[PDB]
Design a protein around this ligand. Structure first.
Ligand code: CA
Ligand code: CA
Ligand code: CA
Ligand code: CA
Ligand code: CA
Ligand code: CA
Ligand code: CA
Ligand code: CA
Ligand code: CA
Ligand code: CA
Ligand code: CA
Ligand code: CA
Lengths: 277, 277, 261, 261
């Protein structure tokens, strides 16, 4: 669970005694739902970001920093910013960032990103830019997860594919049983789920505590959490309508009494929350 | 833990077979840290709010609604608003509110607030007003907790008094042992803690997940969570400096290795979080 | 036009060679557009409790009232001289001491947070709006006719006679087929006037799709800015009064230009 | 003064009896104050990829650029015609079709969320600022002298000769004791000009404590509005250029009045 137990598990290569991650080790390490021959075609942005020095390997230091950035909740980014903005000028400069990398590395058992700070290393991040950077990063990793189920690069996945994903987020032969009912083709009568609608669903899981409140409020009015409540809450939380295939799959997979009301025992208490949520 | 198990425990009076809460039952029921002869002088605002019909008793229906409103996190209020705004006009009218009360009551085992909607019942709540109302409510209950330790109405409590409070929030002879070192007088050399600074501390516990992130970020840079880190984080979260007596007491009570770094085992993992946090 | 000129002109009581405002002077001064029991507004302004408003008291009240809701955090930081996140009574009465010498509890021990300060300014703004509306609701109905709303609109404007010829067309009675306008809607319409820039943006986005700014656009924009349903009668009165050329399109003249930020 | 007048005046290419802008026409048009490789700005504007900017393309670009960061949610809702929380390619190219007929992926299958739209508009605004700054940084240093900053300030103004006599006093060289102004600071100063109402508020709050608006106030206000430390050299140049009467107090004339919302 710790990023140092993750790193020792997955760092498959040594150089001058020091452990290191190849590209494929890195991708395995940051896709825990898929990994507990990846035929990589391109080098993911996530890797180029994590690999600060540019030797094409992820150090312990580099992995810890990448983990840390990725683990920051969207709504707590400003707090993290103020901590890493060591001189309080409201910008993060290359040195404040390389400073962190240096310490994390020197805390390795063994013991500048041109991408963010420019070729020269002379640019800085405001809070807004830093929010944007943490966004691209989160989205990139979602893209890696997504692509396992869409190797063609179509832009979308089947409903069965979406269901495997949903199960990967769980904890399942009961949950697996429902996949049978789920389409495995994208035709006219069976639509797929877009990356965008996968990202939105991750938005919903980030705010799982707000789905929880929603279910407790409707339970009061004696309203079952049907697909219409599910739709409305997602709209409020995600700011985007869910499309039906999303909702249909969620219900199919998780509504294990088929009764049409998605309870707390059936969905909220089955999704592993995030580190600070 | 459920508000219906709370209500059956505490509703000490019956009328036409139906169970009910007196003022003192109500105050016991909503101060769980203090209650698992209150000599009430005035009738608390919380009671006047919870008692919609005005018979001077809290029904099951009235207690469920009061619980529900009080349990809503500050940052999730807009979600709750949109659920209770049944006709989507962006206002909560008396009927939308009385509608909820009616259903909660009719879900009792046995089976308009002039305060919010006006004498006539003809006023409504925007989201902002609804946020304000939920605020006053949260603050009122904090005032009830506070007053147990300040019966005089001085405006402040001793550091020992503040420490008992902190322990009430825990889970303690180890934690109790430290109270010995804590002043029990408000003199010149020993200052008390104001209600304001008690409210701010509750703000800090509401965002305990952000203290958690802070501790994990400093742990990386290999910075111990000393009183200076504690100060700075509270400022970021609460938007108010903590005064020293607050910090001194927190450390005294919870820093059980006296080592000067407040760990996660020592504080974060000792405070029972809120219902959706 | 400045609040010092305003104070001079409305302060009726001369005592010890200074001017002072009674309750009625103070109400006429804070309702510039338009000119029982004592208002919360007056009680807040009378820091010394002498039952009159001094020049310093009025300038202070005027300053706090001038602060736009969106900029209250900026004003809070300027007033929190020490940077501790709370406005104490010493800091709050800073202007008052200076403008006078040429909330905090009876012990003045309470410190205001930004949320509390936002709340305070909100009550203040609402009170001044109640006073302006109560000028057209003496019976205390809680609603005003369409024609009374029209006058209140013309007051907020910058009397064209055409403005005054529109009022005939507007009902002066409330009845089952001629609804009245509630206080809550008058407040909400005041929100809309705080975000008049946002209305202007929307007018450009609509013209870009060859869509003039009709009652249908006015209602939608109003809803996304105020986040509450606009009342038809408010909008009809806006169009009846301000759509001077009566083409059904409310131009940037006519309304936005006619009404800190 | 309107973008239709602007387009007419700068579109140099006449073909098929319509006017069109080259890259250089387009850069001169979007940098009104002031008038290598191809800018992201031009690439976004050229929806059809013909390598020129049409009248419709330019009006569309101009509209999106005009949207203030704080009002992007309002603009998003107007553009999301169906109310589903996403702007599709059909909705986005609505204005373009209409103004022309008198992001979304190669398949145009991508839908923009509000966050993505905010991001897009942010890149656009930053690109136009880079172009304006690069006009005074040809060497690509990433910093500009104080005198070049002064000119850029005078460009944003509404040439008084006094404006031009101030520039002599300002260094035209960067050296260890005459610092230059970075792009990041020019951007941050642009934020300050977006919130000029907030600067005006602060000027009133300061006068209320008998405190004139000096470099010390200017720095503090700037910091709480932009949330980044102001550079001394930016502020000194503002005072040198705009404090026309040289009393050390930057009045509402001189600056706020001199520069939607
Ligand atoms: Ca590396
Ligand atoms: Ca910094
Ligand atoms: Ca079910
Ligand atoms: Ca009752
Ligand atoms: Ca409603
Ligand atoms: Ca410790
Ligand atoms: Ca007085
Ligand atoms: Ca203070
Ligand atoms: Ca018109
Ligand atoms: Ca073109
Ligand atoms: Ca749409
Ligand atoms: Ca001057």
């Amino acid at each position: 669970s710790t990023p140092e137990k993750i790193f020792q598990c997955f760092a498959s290569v040594k150089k001058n005694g020091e452990s290191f991650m190849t590209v494929e080790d890195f991708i395995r390490a940051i896709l825990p739902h898929q990994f507990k021959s990846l035929n990589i075609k391109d080098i993911p942005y996530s890797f180029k970001i994590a690999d600060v020095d540019g030797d094409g390997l992820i150090s312990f230091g580099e992995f810890m920093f990448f983990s840390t950035l990725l683990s920051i909740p969207e709504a707590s980014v400003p707090i993290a910013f103020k901590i890493m903005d060591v001189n309080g000028d409201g910008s993060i400069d290359a040195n404040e960032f390389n400073s962190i990398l240096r310490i994390l590395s020197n805390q390795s058992p063994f013991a500048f990103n041109s991408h963010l700070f420019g070729k020269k290393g002379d640019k800085r991040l405001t809070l807004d830019q830093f929010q944007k950077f943490l966004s691209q990063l989160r989205r990139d990793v979602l893209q890696l997860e997504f692509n396992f189920y869409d190797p063609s690069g179509r832009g979308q996945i089947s409903q069965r594919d979406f269901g495997l994903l949903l199960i990967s987020y769980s904890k399942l032969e009961h949950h697996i049983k429902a996949l049978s009912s789920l389409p495995n083709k994208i035709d006219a009568n069976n639509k797929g789920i877009s990356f965008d609608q996968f990202v939105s669903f991750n938005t919903l899981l980030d705010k799982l505590h707000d789905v929880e409140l929603s279910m407790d409020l409707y339970k009061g009015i004696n309203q079952p959490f049907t697909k219409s409540q599910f739709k409305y809450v997602s709209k409020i939380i995600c700011n985007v309508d869910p499309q039906p295939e999303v909702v249909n799959t969620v219900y199919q997979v998780f509504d294990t009494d088929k009764n049409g009301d998605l309870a707390k025992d059936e969905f909220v208490e089955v999704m592993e929350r995030r580190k600070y949520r």
